[PDB]
Amino acid sequence: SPNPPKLTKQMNAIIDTVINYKDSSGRQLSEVFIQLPSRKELPEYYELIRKPVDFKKIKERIRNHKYRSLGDLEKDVMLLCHNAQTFNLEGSQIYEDSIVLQSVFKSARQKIA
Ligand SMILES: CC1(C)c2cc(C3CCNCC3)ccc2-n2c1nc(=O)c1c(Br)cccc12
Ligand SMILES: [Zn+2]
């Protein structure tokens, strides 16, 4: 099992849709989640978050064929949104952002596979 091209294209498309998504207001919800903060700017995050992941890492994993399925991919997206729900205050915009991105990923997953 190496990963067929179509799987890899699918994932990229899905994760591309999540990243480029904008709300009605025109805003791109993912922007903050693309890169993990520095251990200098936000050391508490890395005390508080067991397994840190950003959208850059997810793309690394797709490119390097490390997800064996769409469901392995999804498990890293939900970790991302979960890390974001853990660290950020409930009802904060980042917290709410992560929940919509969960949703956007699921929709993308059906419109694409
Ligand atoms: C909102 C917060 C804490 C954050 C702040 C900053 C900056 C802003 C400007 N001043 C310094 C810090 C950067 C990155 C992130 N970030 C955050 N929460 C996440 O959940 C998260 C995830 Br899953 C993946 C990647 C980054 C994340
Ligand atoms: Zn390859």
Curated annotation (Swiss-Prot):
The modification Phosphoserine is found at residue 1. It is found in: Nucleus. Disulfide bonds: none annotated. During apoptosis, cleaved by cathepsin CTSG to produce a 160 kDa cleavage product which localizes to the cytosol. Ubiquitinated. Residues 2-112 form the Bromo domain. Zn(2+) binds at residues 65, 82. It is linked to Nicolaides-Baraitser syndrome: A rare disorder characterized by severe intellectual disability with absent or limited speech, seizures, short stature, sparse hair, typical facial characteristics, brachydactyly, prominent finger joints and broad distal phalanges. Some of the features are progressive with time. Blepharophimosis-impaired intellectual development syndrome: An autosomal dominant congenital syndrome characterized by blepharophimosis, facial dysmorphism, global development delay, delayed motor skills, impaired intellectual development with poor or absent speech, and behavioral abnormalities in some patients. Additional variable features include distal skeletal anomalies, feeding difficulties with poor growth, respiratory infections, and hypotonia with peripheral spasticity. ATPase involved in transcriptional activation and repression of select genes by chromatin remodeling (alteration of DNA-nucleosome topology). Component of SWI/SNF chromatin remodeling complexes that carry out key enzymatic activities, changing chromatin structure by altering DNA-histone contacts within a nucleosome in an ATP-dependent manner. Binds DNA non-specifically. Belongs to the neural progenitors-specific chromatin remodeling complex (npBAF complex) and the neuron-specific chromatin remodeling complex (nBAF complex). Belongs to the SNF2/RAD54 helicase family. Component of the multiprotein chromatin-remodeling complexes SWI/SNF: SWI/SNF-A (BAF), SWI/SNF-B (PBAF) and related complexes. The canonical complex contains a catalytic subunit (either SMARCA4/BRG1/BAF190A or SMARCA2/BRM/BAF190B, mutually exclusive) and at least SMARCE1, ACTL6A/BAF53, SMARCC1/BAF155, SMARCC2/BAF170, and SMARCB1/SNF5/BAF47. Other subunits specific to each of the complexes may also be present permitting several possible combinations developmentally and tissue specific. This is SWI/SNF-related matrix-associated actin-dependent regulator of chromatin subfamily A member 2. It comes from Homo sapiens. The gene is SMARCA2.
